[PDB]
Amino acid sequence: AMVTLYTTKYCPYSLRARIALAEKKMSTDIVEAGDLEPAMIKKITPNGVFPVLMEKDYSINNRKALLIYIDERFPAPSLLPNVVNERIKIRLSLDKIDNEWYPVLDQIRKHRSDQKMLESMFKDLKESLLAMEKAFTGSEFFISSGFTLADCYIAALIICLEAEGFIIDDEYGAIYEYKKRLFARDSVKKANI
Amino acid sequence: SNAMLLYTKKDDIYSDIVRMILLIKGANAKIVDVSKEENSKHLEELNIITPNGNIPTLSTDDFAVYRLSVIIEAIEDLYPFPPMFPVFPKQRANARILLEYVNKTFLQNIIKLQSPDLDEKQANEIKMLMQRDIISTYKKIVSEREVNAESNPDAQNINVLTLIITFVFYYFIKLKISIPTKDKNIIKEIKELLSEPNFIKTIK
Numbered sequence: 001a002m003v004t005l006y007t008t009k010y011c012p013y014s015l016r017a018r019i020a021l022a023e024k025k026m027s028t029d030i031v032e033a034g035d036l037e038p039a040m041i042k043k044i045t046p047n048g049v050f051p052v053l054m055e056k057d058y059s060i061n062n063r064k065a066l067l068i069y070i071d072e073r074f075p076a077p078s079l080l081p082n083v084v085n086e087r088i089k090i091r092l093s094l095d096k097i098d099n100e101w102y103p104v105l106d107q108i109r110k111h112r113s114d115q116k117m118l119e120s121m122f123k124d125l126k127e128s129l130l131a132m133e134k135a136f137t138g139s140e141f142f143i144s145s146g147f148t149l150a151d152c153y154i155a156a157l158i159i160c161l162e163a164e165g166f167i168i169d170d171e172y173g174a175i176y177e178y179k180k181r182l183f184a185r186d187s188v189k190k191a192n193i
Numbered sequence: 194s195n196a197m198l199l200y201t202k203k204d205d206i207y208s209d210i211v212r213m214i215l216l217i218k219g220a221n222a223k224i225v226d227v228s229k230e231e232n233s234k235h236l237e238e239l240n241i242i243t244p245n246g247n248i249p250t251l252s253t254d255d256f257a258v259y260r261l262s263v264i265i266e267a268i269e270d271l272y273p274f275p276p277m278f279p280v281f282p283k284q285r286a287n288a289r290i291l292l293e294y295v296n297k298t299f300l301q302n303i304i305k306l307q308s309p310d311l312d313e314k315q316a317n318e319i320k321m322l323m324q325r326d327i328i329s330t331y332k333k334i335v336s337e338r339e340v341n342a343e344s345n346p347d348a349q350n351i352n353v354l355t356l357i358i359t360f361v362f363y364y365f366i367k368l369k370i371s372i373p374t375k376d377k378n379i380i381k382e383i384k385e386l387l388s389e390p391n392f393i394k395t396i397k
């Protein structure tokens with residue numbers, strides 16, 4: 001029983017972590033905050049921030065470092081590009097994902113009860129993807145030879161975006177294809193359920 | 194190839210920080226003060242390769258990257274020697290979580306303070322918020338560096354979070370903000386930090 005991950009249900013943040021933890025084929029338990037005690041919760045993560053990653057001696061839940069730490073903790077297989085010019089780019093991309101994209105999900109998660117304010121938020125998101133379906137052709141996985149964190153960031157996104165209503169069709173082109181073979185991966189497939 | 198152009202501005206704390214990292218590595222760094230009128234043609238270039246003229250930007254023929262975590266890691270990709278980060282993943286994560294706090298609380302605020310249309314009351318709440326933590330923060334940067342040095346005496350790496358906290362000080366002095374402590378020892382250290390050769394080569 002080496003390292004356990006505690007995960008709240010709805011989090012897009014908790015999905016993308018169980019993906020990256022799969023690609024590493026590391027035996028790590030998976031627990032639900034909502035299946036434990038209001039006492040232990042305060043012991044594993046005082047600020048109540050899920051998901052959390054416990055080890056014999058360590059503990060971590062920083063949104064920005066959680067995944068980057070999984071990729072370094074269990075090193076093989078690397079979830080960052082090998083070529084330097086591709087790694088430097090892929091980082092600046094994760095940052096865009098977290099900071100320009102995840103906000104769009106939280107917003108669609110908070111003003112979710114307002115149908116007038118959803119239909120218009122969707123219209124702006126679907127409109128933006130299609131202004132990028134152009135730079136999606138020419139790679140099996142996102143802007144890369146193999147699987148990156150960028151794919152874990154984006155699986156969890158599409159997946160939680162789906163549950164919030166927003167779906168992806170044939171209208172998106174490369175994106176739909178990419179989204180379909182992203183869902184194909186065994187690592188994404190597990191956390192999905 | 195190695196046409197590394199580092200777009201910076203004057204008195205921008207992030208540029209000064211990056212410039213001393215490139216200096217530490219040895220990077221062939223064609224610096225570009227986009228604050229000078231002369232470089233008007235470069236700032237034209239920059240508003241094209243980045244979305245909001247992001248300063249500083251580290252560009253080559255291959256990429257154009259902004260954000261400070263990005264750049265710092267980029268530099269470590271392009272110039273492994275000598276090592277900026279620790280080696281144990283836990284210690285690396287911590288340096289990253291700390292660097293986030295130092296950026297939100299100090300760097301980001303140091304910038305808000307350079308805004309000419311700032312309320313004199315708001316600007317005073319910033320200046321104070323900073324004093325309030327600068328010390329406790331400093332300690333953490335230390336405790337952490339102490340661990341990362343011993344757990345590997347043969348590795349001998351440069352603490353990036355001590356390098357940054359040094360510039361936070363310089364900019365305290367620079368903004369007439371006061372470093373609230375009477376610890377004669379702490380004071381001894383903050384003087385040493387500003388007394389390091391690579392630091393005096395940068396601001397010069």
Ligand SMILES: Nc1nc2c(ncn2[C@@H]2O[C@H](COP(=O)(O)OP(=O)(O)O)[C@@H](OP(=O)(O)OP(=O)(O)O)[C@H]2O)c(=O)[nH]1
Pocket residue numbers: 098099100207248249259260261262293296297301304
């Ligand atoms: N001027 C300047 N700012 C930097 C630099 N590096 C990081 N920042 C800023 O630090 C702020 C904190 O961003 P992060 O810690 O990375 O993530 P977060 O905003 O979601 O908490 C960002 O501003 P923000 O307004 O909070 O978000 P955003 O609009 O940039 O996305 C970001 O623009 C830099 O080198 N120069």
Ligand SMILES: [Mg+2]
Pocket residue numbers: 099100
């Ligand atoms: Mg942001």
